[PDB]
Amino acid sequence: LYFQSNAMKHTIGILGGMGPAATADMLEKFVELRHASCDQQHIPLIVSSIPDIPDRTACLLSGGPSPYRYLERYLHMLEDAGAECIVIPCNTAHYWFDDLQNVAKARMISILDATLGDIPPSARHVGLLATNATLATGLYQKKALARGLTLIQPEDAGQALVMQAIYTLKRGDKTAAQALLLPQIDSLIARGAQAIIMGCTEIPLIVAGHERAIACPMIDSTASLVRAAIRWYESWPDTR
Amino acid sequence: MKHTIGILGGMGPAATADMLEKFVELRHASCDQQHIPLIVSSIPDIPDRTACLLSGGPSPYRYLERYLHMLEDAGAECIVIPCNTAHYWFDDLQNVAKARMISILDATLGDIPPSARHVGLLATNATLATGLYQKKALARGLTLIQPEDAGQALVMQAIYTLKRGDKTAAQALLLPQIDSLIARGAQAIIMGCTEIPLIVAGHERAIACPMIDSTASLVRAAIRWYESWPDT
Numbered sequence: 241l242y243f244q245s246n247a248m249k250h251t252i253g254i255l256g257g258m259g260p261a262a263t264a265d266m267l268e269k270f271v272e273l274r275h276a277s278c279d280q281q282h283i284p285l286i287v288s289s290i291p292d293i294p295d296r297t298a299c300l301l302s303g304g305p306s307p308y309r310y311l312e313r314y315l316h317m318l319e320d321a322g323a324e325c326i327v328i329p330c331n332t333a334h335y336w337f338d339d340l341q342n343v344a345k346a347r348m349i350s351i352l353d354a355t356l357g358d359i360p361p362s363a364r365h366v367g368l369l370a371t372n373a374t375l376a377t378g379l380y381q382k383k384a385l386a387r388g389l390t391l392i393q394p395e396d397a398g399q400a401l402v403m404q405a406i407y408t409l410k411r412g413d414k415t416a417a418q419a420l421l422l423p424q425i426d427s428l429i430a431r432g433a434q435a436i437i438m439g440c441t442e443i444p445l446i447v448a449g450h451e452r453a454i455a456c457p458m459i460d461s462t463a464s465l466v467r468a469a470i471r472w473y474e475s476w477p478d479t480r
Numbered sequence: 481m482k483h484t485i486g487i488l489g490g491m492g493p494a495a496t497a498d499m500l501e502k503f504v505e506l507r508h509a510s511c512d513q514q515h516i517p518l519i520v521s522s523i524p525d526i527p528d529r530t531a532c533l534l535s536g537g538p539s540p541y542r543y544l545e546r547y548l549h550m551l552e553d554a555g556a557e558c559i560v561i562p563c564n565t566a567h568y569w570f571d572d573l574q575n576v577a578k579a580r581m582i583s584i585l586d587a588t589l590g591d592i593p594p595s596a597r598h599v600g601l602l603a604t605n606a607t608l609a610t611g612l613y614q615k616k617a618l619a620r621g622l623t624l625i626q627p628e629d630a631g632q633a634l635v636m637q638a639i640y641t642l643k644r645g646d647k648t649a650a651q652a653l654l655l656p657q658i659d660s661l662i663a664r665g666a667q668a669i670i671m672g673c674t675e676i677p678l679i680v681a682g683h684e685r686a687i688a689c690p691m692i693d694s695t696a697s698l699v700r701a702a703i704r705w706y707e708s709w710p711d712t
């Protein structure tokens with residue numbers, strides 16, 4: 241008879257598709273990170289995985305077509321579907337975060353803030369694995385400075401390989417991607433990184449299974465955003 | 481006109497995340513932008529399907545109907561359901577749906593090798609009890625082998641252990657049941673509950689016979705539908 245609307249349900253939209261693998265990984269983490277006795281106790285989620293959004297690095301570094309209009313469209317799709325909170329499992333796309341937040345009715349939670357908060361306070365010197373555009377536009381720079389953090393970026397030659405790893409994953413070869421990425425991780429560690437931000441939502445997929453062999457904590461930006469979204473969801477009177 | 485696929489999910493949420501992964505894995509794409517457009521409803525509050533069917537619990541239908549329309553209104557032109565048990569309501573939804581719907585049952589039977597006549601079935605009690613696969617298998621010339629009652633209780637227990645979050649526990653329960661089916665002559669085993677592939681993951685090669693993944697079967701069928709238009 242009576243159905244509770246998704247808005248009243250505190251439904252969370254995921255504005256994804258950058259890329260699709262990263263979005264599927266976030267969904268997987270919403271299940272893992274939420275305490276639930278059964279199906280019915282899991283978080284209500286609506287997902288946009290609509291990958292036609294233009295490449296973020298091409299736009300930012302090369303003046304390629306901007307993703308922004310697509311972001312706005314699918315954000316509105318989610319809102320109309322009942323999302324009361326929106327999360328974007330793409331670091332690079334947070335270039336547009338403030339712009340989107342201007343047009344959003346829903347609450348929006350930054351992957352950047354969530355990720356930084358999940359770094360141990362004691363880690364002062366922190367590696368950053370991210371797309372070229374995320375580094376170039378300094379998305380993490382401002383915030384890291386506020387927390388008194390020193391980011392260690394790979395050198396130009398290394399970053400080229402990190403970028404290659406990211407796109408090999410986006411292209412669907414994890415094994416190859418790993419072969420590319422692992423040495424760069426060791427380089428950052430060799431350079432004194434006390435932790436490494438996985439600052440591209442493809443990186444956790446590449447690292448998965450090898451973390452136990454990595455000599456410092458990896459901070460997972462996707463997981464960080466999920467945890468932050470769960471906390472939002474669970475702060476409601478009908479949630480707790 | 482983008483041929484967007486809606487996923488009416490959330491039963492349960494792990495099976496839905498699993499379907500998304502397979503969409504990525506099963507679609508040839510040179511880059512993000514060549515992957516399938518997907519809108520996903522994972523809104524798990526849908527009432528337990530088995531409890532309704534077997535135990536007289538609340539009916540999931542009006543929920544399914546609601547999220548169906550939600551997906552259509554977001555622009556999904558084709559809808560898929562990564563729950564076998566939910567297909568008790570498939571025809572009903574299909575009758576209210578403007579978007580195209582693709583049945584997990586047909587897709588899954590279609591992916592069984594022709595040479596496999598005697599096929600094991602791992603599924604929920606409601607899926608077995610309501611005979612979702614039986615009339616369809618019969619028409620194809622298939623003979624379904626299901627676990628004996630004691631074994632089925634353990635299968636059901638494995639499924640709910642996975643939904644509850646322990647994969648390791650679920651495996652300990654499920655694995656012997658798979659071995660039992662093989663001992664009884666199964667030429668292939670349908671994983672007929674969408675949590676099964678998740679439990680079986682990593683042990684597949686350790687299993688003698690082929691396992692037919694209902695989730696994967698649905699994704700492939702959806703991809704085919706997507707790639708079937710003049711502009712795609």
Ligand SMILES: [Cl-]
Nearest residue numbers: 331332440441
């Ligand atoms: Cl990213």
Ligand SMILES: [Cl-]
Nearest residue numbers: 410511512513
């Ligand atoms: Cl790509």
Ligand SMILES: [Cl-]
Nearest residue numbers: 564565673674
């Ligand atoms: Cl199922």
